[PDB]
Amino acid sequence: PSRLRKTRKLRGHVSHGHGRIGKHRKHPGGRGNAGGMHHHRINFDKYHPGYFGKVGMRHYHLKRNQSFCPTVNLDKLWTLVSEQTRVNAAKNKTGAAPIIDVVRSGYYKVLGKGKLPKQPVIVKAKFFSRRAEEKIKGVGGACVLVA
Amino acid sequence: GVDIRHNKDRKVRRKEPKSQDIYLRLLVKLYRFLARRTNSTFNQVVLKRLFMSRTNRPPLSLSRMIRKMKLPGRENKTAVVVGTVTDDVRVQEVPKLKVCALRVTSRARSRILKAGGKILTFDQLALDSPKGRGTVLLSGPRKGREVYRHFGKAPGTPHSHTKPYVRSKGRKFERARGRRASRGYKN
Amino acid sequence: AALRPLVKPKIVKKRTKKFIRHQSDRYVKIKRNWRKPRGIDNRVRRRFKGQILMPNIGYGSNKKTKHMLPSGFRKFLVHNVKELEVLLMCNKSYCAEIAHNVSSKNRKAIVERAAQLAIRVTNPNARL
Amino acid sequence: APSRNGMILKPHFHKDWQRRVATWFNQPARKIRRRKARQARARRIAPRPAAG
RNA sequence: GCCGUCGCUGGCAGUCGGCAGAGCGAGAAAGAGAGUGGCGCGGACGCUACGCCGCGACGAGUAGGAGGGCCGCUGCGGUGAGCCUUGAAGCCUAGGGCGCGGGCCCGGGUGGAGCCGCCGCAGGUGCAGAUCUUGGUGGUAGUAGCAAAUAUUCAAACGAG
RNA sequence: UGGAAUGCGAGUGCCUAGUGGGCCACUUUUGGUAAGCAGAACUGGCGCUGCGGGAUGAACCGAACGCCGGGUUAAGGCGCC
RNA sequence: GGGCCCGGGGGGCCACGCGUCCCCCGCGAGCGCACGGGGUCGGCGGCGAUGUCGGCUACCCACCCGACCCGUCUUGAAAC
RNA sequence: AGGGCGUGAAACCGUUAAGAGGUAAACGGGUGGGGUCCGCGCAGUCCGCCCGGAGGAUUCAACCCGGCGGCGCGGUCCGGC
Ligand SMILES: [Mg+2]
Ligand SMILES: [Mg+2]
Ligand SMILES: [Mg+2]
Ligand SMILES: [Mg+2]
Ligand SMILES: [Mg+2]
Ligand SMILES: [Mg+2]
Ligand SMILES: [Mg+2]
Ligand SMILES: [Mg+2]
Ligand SMILES: [Mg+2]
Ligand SMILES: [Mg+2]
Ligand SMILES: [Mg+2]
Ligand SMILES: [Mg+2]
Ligand SMILES: [Mg+2]
Ligand SMILES: [Mg+2]
Ligand SMILES: [Mg+2]
Ligand SMILES: [Mg+2]
Ligand SMILES: [Mg+2]
Ligand SMILES: [Mg+2]
Ligand SMILES: [Mg+2]
Ligand SMILES: [Mg+2]
Ligand SMILES: [Mg+2]
Ligand SMILES: [Mg+2]
Ligand SMILES: [Mg+2]
Ligand SMILES: [Mg+2]
Ligand SMILES: [Mg+2]
Ligand SMILES: [Mg+2]
Ligand SMILES: [Mg+2]
Ligand SMILES: [Mg+2]
Ligand SMILES: [Mg+2]
Ligand SMILES: [Mg+2]
Ligand SMILES: [Mg+2]
Ligand SMILES: [Mg+2]
Ligand SMILES: [Mg+2]
Ligand SMILES: [Mg+2]
Ligand SMILES: [Mg+2]
Ligand SMILES: [Mg+2]
Ligand SMILES: [Mg+2]
Ligand SMILES: [Mg+2]
């Protein structure tokens, strides 16, 4: 609301809070990002290193669906299945491990961050990290690749 | 005249919650009394943390609370946080806890109770621990916010690992000159 | 014979003249309502001797005698008999002033009911 | 002019964008109209499925 | 002495009453502790805790910042069993007052049909200036002036002239 | 035996306006015959600041300011104004 | 002079029960006056209904001291 | 409300009344004198308890009947949610 703003308190004060000496002029310094390599060079260099120049190959017609690859860590792996899935497997005796299909949950690659509970599991995914497969293998599980 | 400076006379600090919440202020009324009429420094700390702002009251996850309540000699002590206790999906086993919080997320509540623990409000901590005895006051990570990734030496200074403010992330967005020796310089 | 307050402390006024705005005696366009002078060279703003004075919190009135009428009471505007009966228990320190736009007919009821309750009316003899 | 730390912004308001602002104050009236044409169409082809 | 600001992140939920017992300012830690054996029917105020109370220090201000306004203007949601032809708004007032102030209340007069308080919402919301806009009015001032091209006079008529 | 005196509560983080013409004095000091001239150092001032005194005055001397009563002072004064 | 002004042969003490051992040789009651946690009188007088009493401010007038016209740019404005 | 007529401001002007007038007027502080009005003043407050005189009554306490309410660790009453 305009009743809570500075303008109401600045009534009666000449200059409206912009000073008597410098005044409020239209566009001192230029419009927009003018002066980056010039009178505004310190601000750009100080706060925006890398701003000017070119780096890396161009790629015409990038299609971001081609590189779709959502990832999940191992510390979140068991949330993709219900709770009773884990407790049932942990307490059963035949040794049967549940199947966690990360593609069904909307992930493609499995990453290695975290630790798994000591419980065998069969994991299905398009991709694995090297540490993900080791950690999955350390609990008695297996990695299954899908296309 | 007295040769003194007045710029520092007025101490900047909260004497009350900015919030207009009536349940919070009823708790501030409660702990204003306990802080004043009891010599328990704990009440003063809790009374102060009730005035604090949302970012000064970070949420405490379940995993962090379990870690700090597992340190030796903290058995049967009530964990106290002036803030929210959020659930942590990365936790597998939830031990029996007694906790006092301003808020507990819906999933954190079920996990604590299903483990056999007890959840309190702050009006119940007073009737159980008037002076705060047998308590373990805990706090969430204050610097666990995206803003603090942007504070410090300006990103364009030597050995500054400050995060820049960019509208986009990618090869074309602030990586050419000033960030690699092949383009002008680096620091 | 008028009703008297519980106590009648001496009222001390630091200042009784009004604060006339600077240069409001020179123009009709400048109403005497106070305005803080803010010109750079303004000699009233700089507190030169012999010039118009500026109001400041130092002139404040004693908290005890503040808003006190010379009768020793403090006024409270009332628009009807019901509003009057909120002063029943503080009738030794607060009086009733009837609002200007209350009909002459209704002033008889408020001025009457106030007499019964021993509440003092600042303007009982108006719109007769 | 830039002032201390801040994002570098490039708003696309260097054309006559006010001449081509499309307000949405007819949105509820559009939603009613679309629905009223779904109902009159459902009546028109019944018992054929309304969906199509 | 009084006003305000700042600090003491000071004190008060103990109004614990005849289902009673009044204290905790005091130089110097921690209990006005609990036990086991050897007639009257009475007692002010308080506490909108966003409230109330105490003590100490201090108070210049342009540019600029911030806080509080029970300062003021227009409209919206609630509320005031609100005000008003027994007189609304507006306007005038050597009437009486309140507030440090922004302002406000009441008395009288004019007026003739509507208006206001409180809790919130919203803003085309506060003028001394801008050679500011439009309109009105002054002093100047009964003043400059009614002076280019030779010129008028007598009698009568109408007619208030 | 918190290892000199004295005094004082400290630390820390975000956001941030105005400014970016200055000028003056003791002392030091460059150019210039010099200048109420141009240019420096230190500190303090005026600017932003009233008040007593210097008759008068941006800066000198004294002293810095909430609204008051009493007392006493500073620098300056006490023929009359 | 210092040693509760060491020890021996008229004037002020914030000395004043005793069993003892021996160094040395836990409650009296009252009453009262006050240089005592910021003023009271348990002290008085005159005047008062037609010309007199009170009314800060406010209207007019007077006098004494003070007092240059504002906004603004400016190192500097009462500025010719 | 008299046909550009609701209200009817300010500037500016006429007149009536009052006051004043040689350092232009105006202004701050301090009193004083005079006016307009206001106190709808002019023998001066009110309240509790007590003492005493005159009186006068839907006459007090205590008891009985009925109704209502508060509380009860009814040391552990019955019924209820
Ligand atoms: Mg300012
Ligand atoms: Mg300007
Ligand atoms: Mg500003
Ligand atoms: Mg500028
Ligand atoms: Mg701009
Ligand atoms: Mg001081
Ligand atoms: Mg200051
Ligand atoms: Mg400050
Ligand atoms: Mg100046
Ligand atoms: Mg800037
Ligand atoms: Mg910024
Ligand atoms: Mg100040
Ligand atoms: Mg007038
Ligand atoms: Mg009409
Ligand atoms: Mg509007
Ligand atoms: Mg104007
Ligand atoms: Mg002429
Ligand atoms: Mg400049
Ligand atoms: Mg120089
Ligand atoms: Mg020069
Ligand atoms: Mg300046
Ligand atoms: Mg300064
Ligand atoms: Mg000075
Ligand atoms: Mg001289
Ligand atoms: Mg004095
Ligand atoms: Mg002299
Ligand atoms: Mg003079
Ligand atoms: Mg003069
Ligand atoms: Mg200018
Ligand atoms: Mg110049
Ligand atoms: Mg000027
Ligand atoms: Mg000149
Ligand atoms: Mg009319
Ligand atoms: Mg009409
Ligand atoms: Mg008209
Ligand atoms: Mg008319
Ligand atoms: Mg006239
Ligand atoms: Mg005359």
Task: State residue C115 phi and psi, 5-degree precision.
Answer: -60, -40
Residue carrying structure tokens 């018992």: D47
Question: Which nucleotide across the nucleic acid strands is nearest to C13, CA versus C1'?
Answer: G56
CB B150 to CB D5 under 8 A?
A: yes
Residue A26, amino acid: K
Rounded to whole angstroms, the Cα distance separating A85 from A82 reads 5
CB C38 to CB A14 under 8 A?
A: yes
Q: Is the CB of C116 under 7 A from strand E?
A: no
How many Å from the CA of C16 to C1' of G61?
21
D49 Cα to chain B: minimum distance (Å):
43
- Way it was determined: cryo-EM
The radius of gyration of chain B from alpha carbons, rounded to an integer in Å, stands at 23
Rounded to whole angstroms, the Cα distance separating C84 from C95 reads 9
Q: How far apart are the first and last CA of chain C?
A: 21
Among A47, A54, A76, select the one facing B154 at the smallest CB separation.
A47
Residues of C in Cβ contact (< 8 Å) with A20: 40
Q: Which two tokens stand for residue C12?
A: 């001390």
Q: Which two tokens stand for residue C107?
A: 């002033």
Cβ contacts of B5 within 8 Å, gap of 6 or more: none
Q: Report the Cα B82 to chain-centroid distance in Å.
A: 8
| Sheet containing A122-125: order of strands | A99-101, A122-125, A142-145
Helix (H, G, I), strand (E, B) or coil at B68: helix
Contact B74, B136 (CB under 8 A): yes
HSE at residue C4, side-chain half, CA atoms within 13 A, is: 5
How many Å from the CA of C41 to C1' of F46?
15
Q: Report the Cα B148 to chain-centroid distance in Å.
A: 14
Q: Using a 7 Å cut-off to protein CB atoms, list the covered nucleotides of chain E.
A: 1-13, 49-50, 57-69, 71-73, 81-89, 97-103, 105-108, 114, 121-123, 125-126, 128-129
Contact B98, B78 (CB under 8 A): yes
Instruction: Name which of B41, B47, B46, B50 is nearest B17 in CA terms.
Output: B50
CB A49 to CB B165 under 8 A?
A: no
A53 contact C CB<8A: no
Cβ contacts of C22 within 8 Å, gap of 6 or more: C35, C37, C42, C44, C52
Residues of A in Cβ contact (< 8 Å) with D4: 43, 47
Q: Which two tokens stand for residue C70?
A: 């010379």
D5 contact B CB<8A: yes
How many Å from the CA of B32 to C1' of H71?
33
Contact C95, C76 (CB under 8 A): yes
Cβ contacts of A87 within 8 Å, gap of 6 or more: none
Residues of B in Cβ contact (< 8 Å) with A117: 92
DSSP B101: E
- Other beta carbons within 10 angstroms of residue B99's beta carbon come to 24
Contact A121, A90 (CB under 8 A): no
Q: Outline where chain B has alpha helix (H).
A: 22-37, 41-51, 62-68, 106-114, 122-128
Instruction: Name which of B99, B102, B131 is nearest B25 in CA terms.
Output: B102
Residues belonging to chain A = 147
